[PDB]
Amino acid sequence: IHDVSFDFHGRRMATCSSDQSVKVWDKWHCTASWKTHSGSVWRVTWAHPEFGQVLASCSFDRTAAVWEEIVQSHWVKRTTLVDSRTSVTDVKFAPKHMGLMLATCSADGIVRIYEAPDVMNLSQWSLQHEISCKLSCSCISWNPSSSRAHSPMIAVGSDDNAMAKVQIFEYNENTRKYAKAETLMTVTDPVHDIAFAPNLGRSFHILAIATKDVRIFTLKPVRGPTKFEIHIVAQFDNHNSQVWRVSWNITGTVLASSGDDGCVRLWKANYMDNWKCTGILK
Amino acid sequence: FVARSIAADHKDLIHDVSFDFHGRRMATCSSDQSVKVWDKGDWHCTASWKTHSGSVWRVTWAHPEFGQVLASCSFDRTAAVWEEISHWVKRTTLVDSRTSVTDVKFAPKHMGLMLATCSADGIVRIYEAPDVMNLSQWSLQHEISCKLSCSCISWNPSSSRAHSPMIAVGSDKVQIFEYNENTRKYAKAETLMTVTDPVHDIAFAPNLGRSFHILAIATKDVRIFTLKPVPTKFEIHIVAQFDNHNSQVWRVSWNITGTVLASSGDDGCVRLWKANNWKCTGILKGNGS
Amino acid sequence: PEGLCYGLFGDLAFLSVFETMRWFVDTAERYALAGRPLAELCDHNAKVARELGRNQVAQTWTMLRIIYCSRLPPDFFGVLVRDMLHFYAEQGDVQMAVSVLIVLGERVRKDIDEQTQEHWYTSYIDLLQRFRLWNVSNEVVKLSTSRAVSCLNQSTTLHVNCSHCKRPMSSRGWVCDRCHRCASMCAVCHHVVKGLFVWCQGCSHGGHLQHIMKWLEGSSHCPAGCGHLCEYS
Ligand SMILES: [Zn+2]
Ligand SMILES: [Zn+2]
Ligand SMILES: [Zn+2]
């Protein structure tokens, strides 16, 4: 199992592994187990139900696939995204407030973002933008803020020379193209995963970064890309190993962190904004 | 045939009573010009209102498909049409008549929501509403002149394509009128020469798929006529003549299947006649004995 | 080689099925947001909060009742209420902020910019739809002080055509103009379906929603009599 993802409603999962199979579990009997890719599937993610039961899978065979459940209940292969010349590391749907938009990051340093003009026809996608991170991309995370005051923003984490391994890109209304907005020079360790905390009424964006330790940043939007008052607020080194995946609360309050030690731990902040561990799981 | 008094309280004498198609709703035109409505294991009154300036002679429901619609003939030459919204609201008033509206009976629903009124002057009007959604409009189409003092009317419950629209008219002698598509106008169809005594109630019967219509006449003696089609000509035959009332009969009514006939006369006895040949099946009274 | 993902009902997955948020669902279930005076709304909300165990929420509702449903300056408490709303929003508790916005109405809407108000409204609506609470979500949309959210409840208009004529019907009537017959005939009790008319895509038949629901509970055939396996049994 390389990745697990819950649906929007929290009643179904999508598990992809190195056995060339992507499985969907319904609250848990696997209702469909079908071969997807010519290589190992790294990440599989769900999409908003308004577009239907839609899955996106990225694999080592340089292709990203979009699957859709059709009615027993069989899954069909809607589209292949062969624009990547190298393996695709992570794939993530954009939040529903931007419509059906998909973003994929390739190991060659190119992040390709697609969009279906007709949400009722998933067979077509258009490469709206392409971003060059100048380093081997590892994982990306969309900004789930539904506020109109925040432009569509995507951060790309590279696992590549002690340079900044986290690049943050922002939409510019005038240029209609993504561009570099924040560069975290303080993050030089290899980055394995990033995950923006769900905004949910907050005035600032909270970023979780997977590195040799766990780092949490509060990219406050200060009053051309918008500048940010970047300040790390949680440097958790309880892992004593490398960090693989980070997942946030459904409300963006508790961060679930998993390291190479095989232990999953949760991090929450008190009213002093002092983050502390609220539980150890294994 | 067990008779039991219904738990209903009325402060005025009731002139006419009419059930609904389902048999749940009912209407009465009491002596105080009040049109009441009761609902169904007992009866619960749900509406009561004064309608006209004169006495309300007959009140009858319409088909539930068009909605809970009530009509009421009066002495003020008016036949108000009421609707239910429970706040019953008068929809229109058909004051085109010149004399007292002796009776009003709704037409069968198989040809839309139509209305006919017999005036004491001897002319029977027919009103229709082209727009069912708007009952405030009723356009007079047919002015049937009976040339005699009208007393009651009854529509033909037949709904087959082979039977034209049909209206019965009494006097106080029996003239039956049928619709003619060739001229697109009502005309005379038949006459009961065997009826000479004044009529107080004329009623057809629900055919329920018969090859002929059944006519019941309220007179000094109850008479049943079987109108067999062959204006379409008719084989008018008399199959019953009961003098058990020994008085002028005021009301006649058929069951839902048109098989048993109720006749109420001045003797204060409700009598049920059923096919066997027609013979009495039960003699009632005021107290129900 | 490791994959971590958190869930909507608090479930944690890593395959781990760690179960590890009923308060939000309950508060959405029995808050009162309109149809009653301000004092009654605040009192009911505070009673619900205290019964659930959120003492601060009940105290906030009662304090709002004191502040507004009552000298001090009329606008002396506006900054305070705006700060309370922002404090609830910034900590991730959006239901309280949106409920206060609904209950207070225009008394506090002008104190918050439309962008942040719409952001809160959308976040709360997304949370409600996540927990499969359509009733409360639609109530919030309908009562929304922002026109953008209220307009989100409107391609929700269905077009109906009479089958006997294959022509459109009026958007306010139940009677076909051409065929001159009621095309909304009930398929069970045989009456006029003026209101809710449940439909079937296959046989194009239907009637009263309650009647159809009661009929499908005892059989599987279409009541109109076409043989279409509507419920497939
Ligand atoms: Zn039609
Ligand atoms: Zn019905
Ligand atoms: Zn059907």
Q: Is B130 exposed, middle or buried (0-12, 13-18, 19+ CB in 10 A)?
A: exposed
Contact (CB, 8 A) for B57 and B73? yes
Whole-angstrom distance, CA of residue C65 vs CA of residue C37: 10
Contact (CB, 8 A) for B121 and B131? no
Ion ligand 1 nearby residues (CB, 5 A): C 162, 164-165, 176, 178-179
Strand, coil or helix: A50? helix
Chain B residue closest to C193 (CA)? B65
Q: State whether residue A158 sits within 8 Å of chain C by CB.
A: no
DSSP per-residue string spanning B42-100: --EEEEEEE--SS-EEEEEE--GGG-SEEEEEESSS-EEEEEE---EEEEEE----SS-
Q: What are phi and psi of C23, to 5 degrees?
A: -65, -45
Whole-angstrom distance, CA of residue A168 vs CA of residue A44: 22
Of C6, C93, C126, the CB nearest to A247: C6
C151 is in an annotated binding site: no
Ion ligand 2 nearby residues (CB, 5 A): C 186, 188-189, 191, 208, 211
Q: State whether residue A29 sits within 8 Å of chain C by CB.
A: no
Chains interfacing with A (3 or more CB pairs < 8 Å): C
> In which element (H, E) is residue A140 found?
strand A137-142
Whole-angstrom distance, CA of residue A257 vs CA of residue A268: 11
SS (HEC) of A66-122: EEEEECCCEEEEEEEECCCCCCEEEEEECCHHHCCEEEEEECCCEEEEEECCCCCCC
Whole-angstrom distance, CA of residue A67 vs CA of residue A60: 17
DSSP per-residue string spanning B163-200: S--EEEE----EEEEEEETTTTEEEEEEEETT--SPPS
Neighbours of A81 (CB within 10 A): 20
Could you tell me the maximum CA-CA distance found in chain C, to the nearest angstrom? 74
Q: What are phi and psi of C203, to 5 degrees?
A: -90, -5
* Closest C-alpha among A183, A185, A274, A272 to residue A236: A274
Query: What kind of experiment solved this structure?
Result: cryo-EM
| Buried b / exposed e along A124-160 (16+ C-beta atoms within 10 A) | ebeeebebebebbbbbbbbbbbbbeebbbbbbbbbbe
List the 48-87 stretch of B: residues with Cβ below 8 A of C. Answer: 64-65, 67
* Closest C-alpha among B196, B229, B195, B197 to residue B213: B229
The token duo for B27 is: 């209407």
Of B67, B112, B133, the CB nearest to C173: B133
Whole-angstrom distance, CA of residue B214 vs CA of residue B235: 12
- Residue A180 pairs in a beta bridge with A169
Contact (CB, 8 A) for A57 and A22? yes
Contact (CB, 8 A) for C2 and A247? no
DSSP per-residue string spanning chain C: ----EE-SSS-EE----B---HHHHHHHHT---SSS-HHHHHHHHHHHHHHHT-HHHHHHHHHHHHHH-----TTSSHHHHHHHHHHHHHTT-HHHHHHHHHHHTHHHHTTS-HHHHHHHHHHHHHHHHHTT-HHHHHHHHHH-SSHHHHGGG-------EETTTTEE--TT-SS-TTT-S-TTB-SSS-SB--S-EEE-TTT--EEEHHHHHHHHTT--S-TTSS---SS--
Residues in C touching A1 (Cβ below 8 Å): 3, 15
Whole-angstrom distance, CA of residue B154 vs CA of residue B149: 16
Could you tell me the maximum CA-CA distance found in chain B, to the nearest angstrom? 52
C182 is in an annotated binding site: no
Strand, coil or helix: B30? strand
* Closest C-alpha among C121, C24, C88, C60 to residue A202: C88
Say how many Å lie between the CA of residue B66 and the centre of ligand 2: 14
Pairing of strands B14-19, B26-30: antiparallel
Q: State whether residue B235 sits within 8 Å of chain C by CB.
A: no
Cβ C5–A1 below 8 Å, yes or no? Answer: no
Q: What is the resolution of this structure in A?
A: 3.5
Question: Can you say how many angstroms the Cα of residue B217 is from the centroid of all Cα atoms in its chain?
Answer: 12
Strand, coil or helix: A234? strand
DSSP state of A49: G
Whole-angstrom distance, CA of residue B21 vs CA of residue B23: 5
Residues in C touching B64 (Cβ below 8 Å): 191
Strand, coil or helix: B169? strand
Q: What are phi and psi of B248, to 5 degrees?
A: -65, 130
Whole-angstrom distance, CA of residue A219 vs CA of residue A206: 6
Chain B residue closest to C183 (CA)? B65
The token duo for B124 is: 């029977």
Contact (CB, 8 A) for A17 and A3? no
* Closest C-alpha among B156, B69, B157 to residue B113: B69
Residues in C touching B131 (Cβ below 8 Å): 175
Question: Can you say how many angstroms the Cα of residue A217 is from the centroid of all Cα atoms in its chain?
Answer: 16
Question: Can you say how many angstroms the Cα of residue C5 is from the centroid of all Cα atoms in its chain?
Answer: 29
CA distances from A145 to A7, A170, A217, B57 (A): 18, 13, 16, 74
Residues in A touching C10 (Cβ below 8 Å): 250
Say how many Å lie between the CA of residue A116 and the centre of ligand 1: 39
Give the B:C interface size as CB pairs under 8 Å.
13
Q: How far is C226 from chain B (nearest CA, A)?
A: 23
Whole-angstrom distance, CA of residue C86 vs CA of residue A40: 46
The token duo for B137 is: 């409009």
Chains interfacing with B (3 or more CB pairs < 8 Å): C
Contact (CB, 8 A) for A254 and A266? yes
The token duo for B127 is: 């009103």
Say how many Å lie between the CA of residue C205 and the centre of ligand 1: 15
Say how many Å lie between the CA of residue C179 and the centre of ligand 1: 4
* Closest C-alpha among A165, A100, A114, A115 to residue A138: A165
Rg (C-alpha) for chain A, rounded Å, is 18
The full length of chain B comes to 289
* Closest C-alpha among A226, A259, A232 to residue A245: A259
Neighbours of C142 (CB within 10 A): 13
Contact (CB, 8 A) for B189 and B232? yes
SS (HEC) of A240-276: CCCEEEEEECCCCCCEEEEECCCCEEEEEECCCCCEE
C86 is in an annotated binding site: no
DSSP per-residue string spanning B107-148: PPTBTBSEEEEEETTSEEEEEE-S-TT-TT--EEEEEEE-SS
Residue A138 makes CB contacts below 8 A (sequence gap 6+) with: A89, A90, A105, A157, A158, A159, A190, A191, A192, A193
Contact (CB, 8 A) for C149 and C120? no
* Closest C-alpha among A150, A161, A106 to residue A131: A106
Helices marked H in A2-75: none
Whole-angstrom distance, CA of residue A129 vs CA of residue B189: 86
Q: State whether residue A31 sits within 8 Å of chain C by CB.
A: no
Q: State whether residue A145 sits within 8 Å of chain C by CB.
A: yes
Neighbours of B285 (CB within 10 A): 11
- Helices H / strands E in chain A, number of each: 0, 25
Say how many Å lie between the CA of residue C160 and the centre of ligand 1: 11
The full length of chain A comes to 282
Contact (CB, 8 A) for A109 and A75? no
Contact (CB, 8 A) for A226 and A169? no
* Closest C-alpha among B287, B267, B286, B283 to residue B1: B283
Q: State whether residue A28 sits within 8 Å of chain C by CB.
A: yes
Chain C residue closest to A272 (CA)? C91
Q: What are phi and psi of B185, to 5 degrees?
A: -155, 145
Chain C residue closest to B63 (CA)? C191
Q: How far is A11 from chain C (nearest CA, A)?
A: 8
Say how many Å lie between the CA of residue B161 and the centre of ligand 1: 21
Residue C32 makes CB contacts below 8 A (sequence gap 6+) with: C40, C41, C44, C45
The token duo for A1 is: 């199992």
Residue B64 makes CB contacts below 8 A (sequence gap 6+) with: B20, B21, B22, C191
Cβ B65–C180 below 8 Å, yes or no? Answer: no
Whole-angstrom distance, CA of residue B177 vs CA of residue B199: 16
- Check contact B-A (3+ Cβ pairs < 8 Å): no
Contact (CB, 8 A) for A15 and A28? no
The token duo for A19 is: 């056995």
- Residue A46 pairs in a beta bridge with A55
- Residue B204 pairs in a beta bridge with B215
The token duo for A226 is: 């918008």
Whole-angstrom distance, CA of residue A143 vs CA of residue B148: 90
Whole-angstrom distance, CA of residue B127 vs CA of residue B64: 18
Q: Which amino acid is at C207?
A: G
Pairing of strands A29-34, A41-46: unpaired
Contact (CB, 8 A) for A4 and C3? yes
User: Virtual CA dihedral for C38, C39, C41, C44, nearest 10 degrees?
Assistant: 170
> In which element (H, E) is residue A233 found?
strand A232-236
Residues in B touching C174 (Cβ below 8 Å): 133
Q: What are phi and psi of C217, to 5 degrees?
A: -80, -10
Neighbours of C35 (CB within 10 A): 8
Q: Which amino acid is at B70?
A: L
- Chain B contact probe: residue of C170, C171, C182 with most B CBs at under 10 A: C182
Of A13, A146, A250, the CB nearest to C13: A13
Residues in C touching B112 (Cβ below 8 Å): 180
Instruction: Show contacts of A25-32: CB within 8 Å, 24+ apart.
Output: A28/C17, A31/A73, A32/A69, A32/A73, A32/A74, A32/A75
Residues in B touching C192 (Cβ below 8 Å): 65, 67
* Closest C-alpha among C118, C101, C14 to residue C64: C101
Strand, coil or helix: A51? helix
Q: What are phi and psi of C101, to 5 degrees?
A: -60, -40
- Check contact C-B (3+ Cβ pairs < 8 Å): yes
* Closest C-alpha among A281, A278, A262, A259 to residue A270: A278
- At CB < 8 Å, which residues of chain C contact A? 1-18, 20-21, 86, 88-94, 97, 115-116, 118-120, 122-123, 126-127, 130, 132
CA distances from C215 to C9, C87, C203 (A): 35, 52, 16
Chain A residue closest to C97 (CA)? A201
Chains interfacing with C (3 or more CB pairs < 8 Å): A, B
The token duo for B209 is: 């798929």
Least distant ligand from the CA of C209? 2
Could you tell me the maximum CA-CA distance found in chain A, to the nearest angstrom? 54
The token duo for A159 is: 């696992």
Residues in A touching C9 (Cβ below 8 Å): 10
Q: Which amino acid is at A93?
A: F
Whole-angstrom distance, CA of residue A106 vs CA of residue A185: 22
Hey, CA dihedral for B248, B250, B255, B258, is it positive or negative? positive
User: Virtual CA dihedral for A50, A53, A57, A62, nearest 10 degrees?
Assistant: -70
Q: Which residue matches tokens 């601060």?
A: C56
Least distant ligand from the CA of C188? 2
Q: What are phi and psi of A87, to 5 degrees?
A: -60, 140
Cβ B132–C182 below 8 Å, yes or no? Answer: yes
| Buried b / exposed e along B69-102 (16+ C-beta atoms within 10 A) | bbbbbbbbbbbbbbbeeeebeebbebebbeebbb
Give the A:C interface size as CB pairs under 8 Å.
126
Rg (C-alpha) for chain C, rounded Å, is 24
CA distances from B172 to A258, B149, B254 (A): 101, 6, 22
Whole-angstrom distance, CA of residue B144 vs CA of residue A148: 74
Contact (CB, 8 A) for B46 and B86? yes
Whole-angstrom distance, CA of residue B194 vs CA of residue B112: 33
SS (HEC) of A153-182: EEEEEECCCCCCCEEEEEEECCCCEEEEEE
Q: Which amino acid is at C56?
A: Q
SS (HEC) of B237-264: EEEEEECCCCCCEEEEEECCCCCEEEEE
CA distances from A278 to A197, A211, A253, A269, B18 (A): 17, 20, 11, 9, 77
Q: Residue A117: which region, alpha, beta or left (left: phi > 0; alpha: psi -120 to 50)? A: alpha
